[PDB]
Amino acid sequence: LPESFDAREQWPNCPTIKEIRDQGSCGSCWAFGAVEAISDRICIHSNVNVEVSAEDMLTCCGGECGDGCNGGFPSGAWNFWTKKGLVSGGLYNSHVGCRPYSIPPCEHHVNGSRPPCTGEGDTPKCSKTCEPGYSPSYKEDKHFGCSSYSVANNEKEIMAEIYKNGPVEGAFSVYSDFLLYKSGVYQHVSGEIMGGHAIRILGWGVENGTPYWLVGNSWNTDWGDNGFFKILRGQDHCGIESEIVAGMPCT
Ligand SMILES: *[C@]1(C(=O)NCCC)O[C@@H]1C(=O)N[C@H](C(=O)N1CCC[C@H]1C(=O)OCc1ccccc1)[C@@H](C)CC
């Protein structure tokens, strides 16, 4: 394994790998880390580009994935992909795909031209129809995963998984000091526990002797380092290596 690895540079034909989404004022990180990585993988292992709908995952998985905007379980999300599949859907108001995200983007712990996130958002309805004008139908726009699995809390195996099969979904404890992250390699030193946060890990590297994981947050691009952040790697910091899940697309 190389000292560094950026899925964005390794798979130039998969632009989803470099894009940052915005979960809005809804605790839907579990769904976002999932559809983002799933999007990357459909592209990696089918070479076709598809914006996997966060809306379909967030609203239709149900109990098997948790409680919608109230939080969910990453592994549960990948299961839904293999069982019910996911339709396409782009950003809020983009009219891209079968089911674009329906929750407005907002400012996540930063000032900007968007409304500030309120964290209090209701889970949207599970509607099995596509936006007007889109084709094919909801049922025919479904993309299925052929396997859902969990990678062990092992730095090397996690790297090998990313190296070989692409970005995976992870989760870690977010403390208040992470909210203000701007650059460098994040290490928890102070702040109250905010809860678990599911995200997308797409690579790793070493910055000034400090090993890290390259992560894509889902708080838009004006948060952190263009929506991404680096986090200490190798010591299960904030449990970043304790809940890695992934899967493979069919055929
Ligand atoms: C992710 C988010 O959008 N965070 C923004 C603010 C930091 O609150 C979102 C989420 O999906 N979190 C999950 C969660 O906290 N859950 C899921 C069920 C309810 C709630 C909970 O009480 O979880 C504790 C729990 C841990 C281990 C097993 C079962 C339950 C997180 C589990 C995912 C990172």
Alpha-carbon distance of 155 to 61, in angstroms, equals 30
Alpha-carbon distance of 166 to 162, in angstroms, equals 4
Q: Is 217 a known active-site residue?
A: yes
Q: How many other β-carbons are positioned within 10 Å of the β-carbon of residue 55?
A: 27
Residue appearing with tokens 């914006």: 51
Of the chain, the end-to-end C-alpha distance in Å amounts to 27
Helix, strand, coil content of the chain in percent (nearest 5): 25, 25, 50
Alpha-carbon distance of 62 to 56, in angstroms, equals 10
- Measured in Å, residue 53 CA sits from the centre of ligand 1 at 20
Q: Would you call 17 helix, strand, or coil by DSSP?
A: helix
Q: Is 106 a known active-site residue?
A: no
Length reported for the chain? 251
Residue with CA at minimum distance from ligand 1 atom 29: 73
Report the interhelical angle of 74-83 vs 29-44 (nearest 10°). Answer: 50
DSSP string, 153-191: S-HHHHHHHHHHH--EEEEEEEEHHHHT--SSEE---S-
Q: What residues does ligand 1 touch, defined as CB less than 6 Å away? A: 23, 27-30, 66-67, 71-73, 171, 174, 194-198
> Any idea what DSSP says for residue 107?
B
Q: Enter the resolution in angstroms.
A: 2.3
Report which of 153, 151, 152, 183 is spatially closest to residue 167, judged by C-alpha positions: 151
H or E element at residue 7: helix 7-10
Which tokens belong to 98?
Answer: 């079968």
- Partners of 70 in the beta sheet? 27
Phi-psi region of 195 (alpha: psi -120 to 50; beta: other; left: phi over 0): left
The values of phi and psi at residue 42, to 5°, are -60, -40
Alpha-carbon distance of 32 to 53, in angstroms, equals 9
What residues have CB less than 8 Å from 6, skipping those under 6 apart? 202, 203, 205, 214
CA angle, 75 as apex, 147 and 19 as ends, to 5°? 90
What residues have CB less than 8 Å from 117, skipping those under 6 apart? 24, 25, 106, 107, 108, 109
Burial-class residue 200 by CB neighbours within 10 Å (0-12, 13-18, 19+): buried
Q: How was this structure determined?
A: X-ray
Report which of 113, 118, 124, 121 is spatially closest to residue 221, judged by C-alpha positions: 113
Question: Which of 58, 73, 107 to mutate to test ligand 1, by most ligand atoms within 8 A of the CB atom?
Answer: 73
Question: Which of 21, 23, 29 to mutate to test ligand 1, by most ligand atoms within 8 A of the CB atom?
Answer: 29
Which tokens belong to 144?
Answer: 């299925």
Residue ranges of the alpha helices (H) in 45-93? 54-60, 74-83
Which tokens belong to 72?
Answer: 């969910």
Beta strands in 20-65 (DSSP E): none
Domains, the chain, ordered by start: 1-251 (3.90.70.10)
Answer whether 234's CB lies under 8 Å from 158's CB: no
Q: Is 109 a known active-site residue?
A: no
Whether cis (ω within 30° of 0) applies to the bond prior to 2 is no
Report which of 66, 58, 67 is spatially closest to residue 99, judged by C-alpha positions: 58
**Residue 114 vs residues 4, 21, 99, 173, 185: alpha-carbon distances, Å:** 35, 14, 22, 26, 27
Alpha-carbon distance of 89 to 108, in angstroms, equals 22
DSSP string, 206-249: EETTEEEEEEE-SB-TTSTBTTEEEEE-SS-GGGTTS-EEEEEE
